[PDB]
Amino acid sequence: RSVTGGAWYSDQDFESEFVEVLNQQCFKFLQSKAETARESKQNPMIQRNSSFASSHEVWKYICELGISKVELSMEDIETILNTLIYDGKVEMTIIAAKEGTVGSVDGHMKLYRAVNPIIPPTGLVRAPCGLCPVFDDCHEGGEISPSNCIYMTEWLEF
Amino acid sequence: KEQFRETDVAKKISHICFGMKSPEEMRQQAHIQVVSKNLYSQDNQHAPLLYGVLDHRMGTSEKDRPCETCGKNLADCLGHYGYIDLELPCFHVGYFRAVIGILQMICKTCCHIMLSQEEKKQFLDYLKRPGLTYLQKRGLKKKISDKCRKKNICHHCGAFNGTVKKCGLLKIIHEKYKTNKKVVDPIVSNFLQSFETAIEHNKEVEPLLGRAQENLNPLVVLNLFKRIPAEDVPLLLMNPEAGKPSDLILTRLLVPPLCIRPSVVSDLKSGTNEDDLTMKLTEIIFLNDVIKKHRISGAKTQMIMEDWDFLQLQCALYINSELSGIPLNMAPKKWTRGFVQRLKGKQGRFRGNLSGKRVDFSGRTVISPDPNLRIDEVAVPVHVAKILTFPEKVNKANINFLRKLVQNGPEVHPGANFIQQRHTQMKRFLKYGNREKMAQELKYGDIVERHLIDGDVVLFNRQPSLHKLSIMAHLARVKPHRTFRFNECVCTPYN
Amino acid sequence: TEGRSRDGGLRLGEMERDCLIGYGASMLLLERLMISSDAFEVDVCGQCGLLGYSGWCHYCKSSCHVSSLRIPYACKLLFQELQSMNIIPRLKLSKYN
Amino acid sequence: LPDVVLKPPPLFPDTDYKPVPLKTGEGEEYMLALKQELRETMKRMPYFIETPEERQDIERYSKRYMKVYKEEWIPDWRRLPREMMP
Amino acid sequence: TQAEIKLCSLLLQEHFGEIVEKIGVHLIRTGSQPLRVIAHDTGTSLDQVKKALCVLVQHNLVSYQVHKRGVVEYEAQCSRVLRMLRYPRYIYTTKTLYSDTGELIVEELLLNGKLTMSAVVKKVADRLTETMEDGKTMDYAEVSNTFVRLADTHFVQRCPSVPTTENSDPGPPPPAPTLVINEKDMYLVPKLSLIGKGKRRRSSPIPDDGIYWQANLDRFHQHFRDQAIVSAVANRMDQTSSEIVRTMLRMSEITTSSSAPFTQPLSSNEIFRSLPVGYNISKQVLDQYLTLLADDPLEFVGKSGDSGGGMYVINLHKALASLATATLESVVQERFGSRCARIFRLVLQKKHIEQKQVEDFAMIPAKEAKDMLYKMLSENFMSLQEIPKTPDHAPSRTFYLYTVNILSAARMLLHRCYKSIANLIERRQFETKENKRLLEKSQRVEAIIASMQATGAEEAQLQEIEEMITAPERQQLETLKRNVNKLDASEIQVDETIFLLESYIECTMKRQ
Amino acid sequence: GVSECIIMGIPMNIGTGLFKLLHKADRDPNPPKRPLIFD
DNA sequence: GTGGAAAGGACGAAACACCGTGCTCGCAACGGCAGCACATATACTAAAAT
DNA sequence: ATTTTAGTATATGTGCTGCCGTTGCGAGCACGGTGTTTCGTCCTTTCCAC
RNA sequence: UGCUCGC
Ligand SMILES: Nc1nc2c(ncn2[C@@H]2O[C@H](COP(=O)(O)OP(=O)(O)OP(=O)(O)O)[C@@H](O)[C@H]2O)c(=O)[nH]1
Ligand SMILES: Nc1ncnc2c1ncn2[C@@H]1O[C@H](COP(=O)(O)OP(=O)(O)OP(=O)(O)O)C[C@H]1O
Ligand code: SF4
Ligand SMILES: [Mg+2]
Ligand SMILES: [Zn+2]
Ligand SMILES: [Zn+2]
Ligand SMILES: [Zn+2]
Structure with missing residues (x-):
């Protein structure tokens, strides 16, 4: 699978749409599970445990969805969830479980839950100066000046 | 009605204030941006391209094509600079030692200088004294550098500051995570254990985990210099009005005018003679374009860093074409002529064009003895006397003499060759036109380029000069022969 | 130019300059090495200290502080080359008085 | 090989990412209004020392009518060193 | 610090004027210098220099220190000039935590820098007499009560007091009185029995003299940090955890300083009894909340002890590091998109990583992930390790590892x-x-x-x-x-x- | 210095350029001033 | 003596980097003042035994 | 508690690999200029058949 | 750039 083939590669072409759909569906499932756990409000420990989703559970859910024809292994969904973690949207915890319906890792099970971001977008990105690509060439007197800036002009006009 | 503005002032230069320019100042000074790596057009006229190298908006180098910025010919065009933007910053080879020094002076975390408040106040008081000389400035810089290199921890943020040294060519290594023979610090242990994923995916990282110190590429060095407090700038012995620490790392290259880069149009073949600076700038533009192409196409990091190092080396060669730490595989094939080579050497600007230069109104001839002349007199041939002219101003005393000189013309030996009027500065050749009418219209104040006649003070020298007596001012007497004749008693000074 | 076939002129070498210095003839040295060899008139801006053209400074976008100045052409070439080397010479002009 | 460019890149290259809209609420608007009030009230404060006007053309009878009058705060010379007394 | 100097120049020009902002910028750029050399380098008259220095030291922007030969040197505080911009936020938070009386108090303290308690209560009464109408007058009693309530909460602090001249070296007066700071009377308000009514701007001897007050910006910074941590933990787990950590930080405010790696540990019993009664929460619910917060991979709190039931401590430096990480990932996401933010979080979690490993772990196709990596390299968002095989440091024979330095x-x-x-x-x-x-x-x-x-x-x-x-x-x-x-x-x-x-x-x- | 004088094209301070010359022109320093009638 | 189609030879032309392949040498041209690495010597200081 | 040994800590002091210089001015001449390695477009000339 | 010369 490493030198050729793969669940994502189709005829030597990376399927960005496929991984995007996988990420969106997994995030929607995790968000719905977390919402149900929050609305259950039975007990904080029980809420956290129900918000957690095992890799096998979400893998079976994706298989039940059947978006693509190619068979997706458990480690494929694990890598998709890891990419979602790298997106700053979900959180994974390794708990101790000897054997169960997953049986993937020896004595360890990975549980994933949708988590809200830490802080809202900062104030720097709300200003055109923070997102400027030519910010280095900024100067008081010159061709690129804050007085005659086009970015701030369009931002104030909008 | 009319505003009073001064025409000309007798301005005299007092002193030259050296300094540096920021990239913004480089953009402001330059007129156009050079982005095309080619020189001439595809058509058979081979006109220079627009917004590229050899563009006539940065001056002119040909007698027929005038400058586009200022509508003047080659003799009147002073030249205009240009600015070329670099995708990745590069270390300035001239200030690279200064860059290393500043990095040793300041902290690598909070950008503050490694000096306590008491030492800061002491150095400020020692620097505030008037009449500070260059030697005192360099000595103070040496002392402050030593006292900063003595310390190892920062008193402002508490971060560790290891040794900063030069590895390879134009590469700086800071030994932040140094090996500690005693009990190791938590920082170095965390740094060593942070390579877990790298070791898992690449086992070769584990044996080479040692010697993995910080590499201060131009990006990080520029980012650090941009955050240096202005209070610590005078402590670095650098004048704040002259320049800033961020100016030591160059991001824009000032391409000089065409006056410094003369181009010869060799119509005998399908090519032109260009200086090495034009080729270096062309290669730099090509390297910038290649780096941009690799960034767009998503190339590997190894080749990206190789292109960056090649760009740094080419910029250094453009500045100084004679380096030492150049790799054998990166060594140039031929020999180029950079600015440093143009400045230093026997044929440099200082020794070949500033201290000793060539002048006109001079001749060179073989000498022959003649004892019948006085010791303060020297015989000049008629042929040379007709060529070397002296500008005499028409006054109330020598008017009748200059009239006869003009009447004689450039053929008879006692005479002149050119007449410059007082009102208009348009010279008039005496070989053409009615010389009698010119003599009758000689106004006071006119310049007459008279021939070398008897009584004119003239310098006589032998090129090998040991003492001052090797060159003396004598009185010229014209003789029909073709040699410089003087009294043999003056042979001992000239040797 | 250098040679006779190129219609060149004689060069006042370094030792000749040393002899002229020893004699103390400042005006003769000035006439030889500046007036008769590479005399030129440049335009310097009194505000930024840079070289202008036709009585105009492109750096400051003004022409009030631009003034003419006599100079050897080799000195102007050296100043331009130094500006190309990021070694910017800033000339602070003043009245001859 | 990379292609040659005839014209320089634009002075302000376009970006597909736009700045996030500012936070809204009563707090942000109140802070904005308070900052504007501070800007308006701190210039008339005696601490805001203006540039001393000079080179009066003439003296006139209307000088007393147009004479700018403003109360001046008295600094505590006990804490301030002696070198700043007028 | 050129950008800092430019910002301070703009602030001093917009807030104080022109002849004073030049002196301020000179002090910031050159540091501590005597008065005469400042006047010489600036190029203005001596009286303007004295006025600028006095109006700067009034707002606590600059300080004066004695040195050898009795010379006085003035040094500016760029940090204070930067904090000057936070005045609207200070006024908003003092209006939120307290009434409008404390709002006006803090406003006058920030606009005047140093004032006495009688002066500030008089000004607050005069300003509040305009807010209300119908002949109602403002008394100094409630104003003094609000002032002492602000004082005990360390929001307003007494300025450094000049030592007694008679007791300390009676004789020749020094060039500078050498103001010293005392923590005993730092937050002790004077007993002022005099009262009065504010005037309605009709336009038709001091007991607390020598005691000057000012705004304690350290307390405001601590309060803002606590609010940020509470908002973060609210966005992370729930509002109940936010209230718990708010009560814990409120308990820790007094018993801790402003700079410490860890706070004083609290037990579950005191947190339970100190929590507001508006929440129907039992002891076991609080224990579960604390033990689940301790297991958070963000390390907001920590156990750090087992005595007294549930003993827990709050990690402040770890919380601030997490907030800085969130800010950095947010600005990366908003400047280069979500995929670049994914690559950034990948290269942040994995301390050292290469291009192929990034492509394998992020599932981003080639020619795009390397582009974003190079873009982040060009903006100093990360540094390369560049582990060399040989001291020659040749690019063809070395490994390049990406690493983000926070x-x-x-x-x-x-x-x-x-x-x-x-x-x-x-x-x-x-x-x-x-x-x-x-x-x-x-x-x-x-x-x-x-x-x-x-x-x-x-x-x-x-x-x-x-x-x-x-x-x-x-x-x-x-x-x-x-x-x-x-x-x-x-x-x-x-x-x-x-x-x-x-x-x-x-x-x-x-x-x- | 002499070297910078030679480079910049100005007369050197050593030699004949150490002193300055003045013209013995017929003049009257501090000439009589016209009185002001209105002031 | 002629022609429609075919090959090949010459001159622009674009990708890449002065050398076909990846190798590969010698010699310093002679002092001479900066140095930076190492190295290492010795003493100062503090921990340990009596 | 005090004298003796261990370490460390910096400074100093002897090297060894760097960079910088090496009279002056003059007059001739010969040669070569960046190109070249392979790909392709164009033009022309000549193997047989008429 | 090279080199032969001229003192
Ligand atoms: N091989 C060779 N190199 C030369 C020749 N002439 C000049 N050069 C090179 O060019 C440099 C000197 O150039 P100059 O002699 O000033 O050229 P120039 O006489 O100004 O050229 P024109 O302007 O065409 O007269 C030297 O460093 C030489 O390497 C020559 O005839 N043969
Ligand atoms: N390389 C040189 N540098 C300076 N001057 C030179 C040089 N070569 C020749 N000259 C000039 O030529 C003169 C040398 O002549 P000199 O050595 O005194 O006599 P000579 O050549 O030994 O004649 P004899 O062999 O004694 O008949 C002196 C000098 O001005
Ligand atoms: S162009 Fe305008 S908006 Fe963009 S960085 Fe410069 S000043 Fe800011
Ligand atoms: Mg001879
Ligand atoms: Zn021009
Ligand atoms: Zn630091
Ligand atoms: Zn100017």
Whole structure:
């Protein structure tokens, strides 16, 4: 699978749409599970445990969805969830479980839950100066000046 | 009605204030941006391209094509600079030692200088004294550098500051995570254990985990210099009005005018003679374009860093074409002529064009003895006397003499060759036109380029000069022969 | 130019300059090495200290502080080359008085 | 090989990412209004020392009518060193 | 610190004037210097230098110190000039936590720098007499109560007091009185029995003399840090955890300083008894909350002890590091998209990683992930390790490992925010100056109405104000107004990120 | 210095350029001033 | 003596980097003042035994 | 508690690999200029058949 | 750039 083939590669072409759909569906499932756990409000420990989703559970859910024809292994969904973690949207915890319906890792099970971001977008990105690509060439007197800036002009006009 | 503005002032230069320019100042000074790596057009006229190298908006180098910025010919065009933007910053080879020094002076975390408040106040008081000389400035810089290199921890943020040294060519290594023979610090242990994923995916990282110190590429060095407090700038012995620490790392290259880069149009073949600076700038533009192409196409990091190092080396060669730490595989094939080579050497600007230069109104001839002349007199041939002219101003005393000189013309030996009027500065050749009418219209104040006649003070020298007596001012007497004749008693000074 | 076939002129070498210095003839040295060899008139801006053209400074976008100045052409070439080397010479002009 | 460019890149290259809209609420608007009030009230404060006007053309009878009058705060010379007394 | 100097120059010019901002910038750039050399280098008269120095030291922007030969040297505090921008946030938080009385108190303290308690209560009464009407007068009793309530909470602190001249070296007066600070009477208000009623601006001996007060910006910074941590933990787990950590931080405020890696540990019993009764929460629910917060991979709190039931402690430096990480990932996401943010979080979690490993772990196709990596390299968001096989450091025979340094990236982001606020202030001043003609026109046409408001006010002056050509220019006036409003809002909102980055940079240093 | 004088094209301070010359022109320093009638 | 189609030879032309392949040498041209690495010597200081 | 040994800590002091210089001015001449390695477009000339 | 010369 490493030198050729793969669940994502189709005829030597990376399927960005496929991984995007996988990420969106997994995030929607995790968000719905977390919402149900929050609305259950039975007990904080029980809420956290129900918000957690095992890799096998979400893998079976994706298989039940059947978006693509190619068979997706458990480690494929694990890598998709890891990419979602790298997106700053979900959180994974390794708990101790000897054997169960997953049986993937020896004595360890990975549980994933949708988590809200830490802080809202900062104030720097709300200003055109923070997102400027030519910010280095900024100067008081010159061709690129804050007085005659086009970015701030369009931002104030909008 | 009319505003009073001064025409000309007798301005005299007092002193030259050296300094540096920021990239913004480089953009402001330059007129156009050079982005095309080619020189001439595809058509058979081979006109220079627009917004590229050899563009006539940065001056002119040909007698027929005038400058586009200022509508003047080659003799009147002073030249205009240009600015070329670099995708990745590069270390300035001239200030690279200064860059290393500043990095040793300041902290690598909070950008503050490694000096306590008491030492800061002491150095400020020692620097505030008037009449500070260059030697005192360099000595103070040496002392402050030593006292900063003595310390190892920062008193402002508490971060560790290891040794900063030069590895390879134009590469700086800071030994932040140094090996500690005693009990190791938590920082170095965390740094060593942070390579877990790298070791898992690449086992070769584990044996080479040692010697993995910080590499201060131009990006990080520029980012650090941009955050240096202005209070610590005078402590670095650098004048704040002259320049800033961020100016030591160059991001824009000032391409000089065409006056410094003369181009010869060799119509005998399908090519032109260009200086090495034009080729270096062309290669730099090509390297910038290649780096941009690799960034767009998503190339590997190894080749990206190789292109960056090649760009740094080419910029250094453009500045100084004679380096030492150049790799054998990166060594140039031929020999180029950079600015440093143009400045230093026997044929440099200082020794070949500033201290000793060539002048006109001079001749060179073989000498022959003649004892019948006085010791303060020297015989000049008629042929040379007709060529070397002296500008005499028409006054109330020598008017009748200059009239006869003009009447004689450039053929008879006692005479002149050119007449410059007082009102208009348009010279008039005496070989053409009615010389009698010119003599009758000689106004006071006119310049007459008279021939070398008897009584004119003239310098006589032998090129090998040991003492001052090797060159003396004598009185010229014209003789029909073709040699410089003087009294043999003056042979001992000239040797 | 250098040679006779190129219609060149004689060069006042370094030792000749040393002899002229020893004699103390400042005006003769000035006439030889500046007036008769590479005399030129440049335009310097009194505000930024840079070289202008036709009585105009492109750096400051003004022409009030631009003034003419006599100079050897080799000195102007050296100043331009130094500006190309990021070694910017800033000339602070003043009245001859 | 990379292609040659005839014209320089634009002075302000376009970006597909736009700045996030500012936070809204009563707090942000109140802070904005308070900052504007501070800007308006701190210039008339005696601490805001203006540039001393000079080179009066003439003296006139209307000088007393147009004479700018403003109360001046008295600094505590006990804490301030002696070198700043007028 | 060129951007910091530019921002301080803009602030001092907008707030104090021109002849004083030059002295301030000179002090910031050159450091501590005697008065005569400052006057010589600046190029202005001596009286203007003295006035600038006094008006700067009044607002606690500069300090004076004695040295050898009895010379006095003045040093400016760039940090204080930067904190000057946080005045609206200080006023908003003191209006939120307290009544409008404390709001006016803090406003007067910030606008005057140093004042006495009698003076500030008199000014607050005079200003609040305008808020209410119908003959109701403002007494000094409630104002003094609010002032002492602000004092015991360390929001307002007594300025350094000059030592007694008679007891300490009686004789020749020194050039500087050498003000010292005492922690005994730092928050002790004087007993002032005198009361009064504020005047309604009709326009028709000091017991607390020598005792000056000021705003304790350290307390405001601590309160802002606590609010940020509470908001973060609320967005993470729930509002119940936010209330728990708010109660814990409120308990820790008094028993801890402003700079410590860990706070004083608290037990579950005191947290339970100190929690507001509005929450129907039992002891076991609090125990579960604490033990689940201790297991958080963000390490907001920690056990750090088992005695007294559930003993727990709060990690402040770890929370600030997490907040800085969140700010950095958010700015990366908003500047380069979500995929670049994914790559950034990947290269942040994995301390060292290469291009192929990044492509394998992020599932981003080639020719795009390397592009974003190089873009982040060009903006100093990360540094390469460059582990060499040989000391030659040749690129063809070495490994390049990507690694994000949070400290350097945070410093670069703080510099970027400083320059951003400077550019915003410059744009606002430019828009104000370019439209000052229409501003004066509108001021005149509105002062026509502002004059003779009631005395001799005929109705024939109301239909001629809009008759002038100012009516089509009212659109440009509204555009200028909304642009200035948005610029000020952005300048205020960037100050939050500035505070976060500055706190992260401050709490990670040792100052040894 | 002499070298910078030679480079910049100005007369060197050593030699004949150490002193300055003045013209013995017929003049009257501090000439009589016209009185002001209005002031 | 002629022609429609075919090949090949010459001159622009674009990708890449002065050398076909990846190798590969010698010699310093002679002092001479900066140095930076190492190295290492010795003493100062503090921990340990009596 | 005090004298003796261990370490560390910096400074100093002897090297060894760097960079910088090496009279002056004059007059001739010969040669070669960046190109070249392979790909392709164009033009022309000549193997057989008429 | 090379080299032969001229003192
Ligand atoms: N091989 C060779 N190199 C030369 C020749 N002439 C000049 N050069 C090179 O060019 C440099 C000197 O150039 P100059 O002699 O000033 O050229 P120039 O006489 O100004 O050229 P024109 O302007 O065409 O007269 C030297 O460093 C030489 O390497 C020559 O005839 N043969
Ligand atoms: N390389 C040189 N540098 C300076 N001057 C030179 C040089 N070569 C020749 N000259 C000039 O030529 C003169 C040398 O002549 P000199 O050595 O005194 O006599 P000579 O050549 O030995 O004649 P004899 O062999 O004694 O008949 C002196 C000098 O001005
Ligand atoms: S162009 Fe304008 S908006 Fe962009 S960085 Fe410069 S000043 Fe800011
Ligand atoms: Mg001889
Ligand atoms: Zn021109
Ligand atoms: Zn530091
Ligand atoms: Zn100028």
